Amino acid sequence: MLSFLLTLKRMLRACLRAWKDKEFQVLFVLTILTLISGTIFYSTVEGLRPIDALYFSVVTLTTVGNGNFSPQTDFGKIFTILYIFIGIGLVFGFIHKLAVNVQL
Amino acid sequence: MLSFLLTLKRMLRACLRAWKDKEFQVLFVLTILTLISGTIFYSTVEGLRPIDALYFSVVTLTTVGNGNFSPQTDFGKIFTILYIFIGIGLVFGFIHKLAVNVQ
Amino acid sequence: MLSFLLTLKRMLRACLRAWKDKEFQVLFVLTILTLISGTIFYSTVEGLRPIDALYFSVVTLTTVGNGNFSPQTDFGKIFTILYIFIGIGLVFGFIHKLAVNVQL
Amino acid sequence: MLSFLLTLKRMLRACLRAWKDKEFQVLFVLTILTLISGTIFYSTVEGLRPIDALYFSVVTLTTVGNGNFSPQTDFGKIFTILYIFIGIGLVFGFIHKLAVNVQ
Ligand SMILES: [Ca+2]
Numbered sequence: 446m447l448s449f450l451l452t453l454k455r456m457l458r459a460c461l462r463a464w465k466d467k468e469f470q471v472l473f474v475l476t477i478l479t480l481i482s483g484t485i486f487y488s489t490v491e492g493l494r495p496i497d498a499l500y501f502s503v504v505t506l507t508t509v510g511n512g513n514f515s516p517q518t519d520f521g522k523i524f525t526i527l528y529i530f531i532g533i534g535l536v537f538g539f540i541h542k543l544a545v546n547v548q549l
Numbered sequence: 550m551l552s553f554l555l556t557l558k559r560m561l562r563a564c565l566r567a568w569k570d571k572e573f574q575v576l577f578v579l580t581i582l583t584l585i586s587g588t589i590f591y592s593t594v595e596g597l598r599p600i601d602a603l604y605f606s607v608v609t610l611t612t613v614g615n616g617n618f619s620p621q622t623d624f625g626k627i628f629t630i631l632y633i634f635i636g637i638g639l640v641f642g643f644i645h646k647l648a649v650n651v652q
Numbered sequence: 653m654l655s656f657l658l659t660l661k662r663m664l665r666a667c668l669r670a671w672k673d674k675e676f677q678v679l680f681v682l683t684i685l686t687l688i689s690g691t692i693f694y695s696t697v698e699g700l701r702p703i704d705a706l707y708f709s710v711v712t713l714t715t716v717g718n719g720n721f722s723p724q725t726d727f728g729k730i731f732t733i734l735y736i737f738i739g740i741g742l743v744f745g746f747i748h749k750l751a752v753n754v755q756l
Numbered sequence: 757m758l759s760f761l762l763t764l765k766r767m768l769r770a771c772l773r774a775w776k777d778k779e780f781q782v783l784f785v786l787t788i789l790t791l792i793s794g795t796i797f798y799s800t801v802e803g804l805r806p807i808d809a810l811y812f813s814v815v816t817l818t819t820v821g822n823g824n825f826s827p828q829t830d831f832g833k834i835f836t837i838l839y840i841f842i843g844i845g846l847v848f849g850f851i852h853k854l855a856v857n858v859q
């Protein structure tokens with residue numbers, strides 16, 4: 446139980462240590478910027494309550510997928526498709542990062 | 550085929566060897582803990598039966614997603630959003646771990 | 653266009669070359685075995701038509717997620733949760749593999 | 757911050773550098789091709805409007821999944837199942853690629 450906590454602490458430290466890498470900060474900022482754009486787009490174009498627009502943005506960008514709402518306009522559908530790929534681009538970016546910071 | 554069996558047993562051994570790594574154990578405990586917290590939350594705030602709260606917590610934290618349930622309260626929605634990123638943080642942790650074991 | 657096809661051929665060869673690795677064959681067999689068990693379970697316990705049981709098994713095991721059907725019995729719900737983790741275990745296995753066969 | 761900008765530009769350059777790799781180009785063309793085939797298939801066999809066939813093809817091949825549409829024919833279901841694995845095969849290809857670029 447003591448080793449558990451010490452390992453947890455070293456791990457958390459390593460995690461926060463990653464919140465210092467500039468390229469990671471960019472990916473993060475870019476992710477937040479993308480989530481905001483999505484929240485704005487879906488509330489405006491699909492008429493979703495802001496909180497539901499951020500929610501749809503989140504489940505869509507992280508690839509989790511939504512099983513309750515689906516864009517009704519041809520405009521929302523096009524945007525969502527592009528939105529999915531941006532999210533995949535961001536994920537690869539984070540993954541590439543982890544891979545690089547592991548083989549130095 | 551004896552080959553297939555031996556190869557599988559080798560892989561199983563390498564797998565059990567992982568469940569011995571302390572960092573992997575932390576990641577595992579943390580997800581079980583996160584899953585329990587999730588179950589509690591959706592039971593309370595969303596009024597779901599425990600088994601449905603665990604189910605939703607699971608399909609959500611694993612990114613599988615569900616096409617049947619959707620949080621009704623703003624609190625439940627905000628929590629789900631953070632829950633998802635915790636899940637992603639957890640997956641990256643496991644992924645980073647498998648990458649380290651590749652050296 | 654010629655380079656394209658030559659790269660495609662080298663890549664395909666490399667792919668088929670992976671269908672020779674014994675550990676990969678095991679993961680594959682294990683995946684097929686798991687999909688069959690799932691098809692049997694969901695058709696039997698949830699009363700799903702076989703084709704719909706394999707389908708649900710597939711979208712669930714690959715984490716794609718289903719937005720039309722959800723287990724109705726407490727038994728199906730427990731199994732699905734365990735099913736999801738087996739699938740994640742299989743994915744990590746395949747990923748660990750790719751990572752190893754890249755850093756030799 | 758000039759730092760942030762320079763770092764982003766560096767990352768963007770490294771990204772464009774990827775779109776120059778032949779193997780990455782093949783993977784990209786193959787997914788666009790797979791996406792088009794998917795659009796054709798769901799338009800024909802499932803009677804979906806082209807834009808809805810592309811949408812479904814996209815949320816399916818990317819593993820995101822959809823909680824609105826579900827194939828009605830047995831042909832559409834069997835195809836979707838193979839479609840998913842093609843998508844996974846494609847993702848592993850990109851992942852394997854990013855791993856190689858780590859050396
Ligand atoms: Ca999903």
Ligand code: NA
Binds near residue numbers: 718
């Ligand atoms: Na879904």
Ligand code: NA
Binds near residue numbers: 508509715716819820
């Ligand atoms: Na997913």
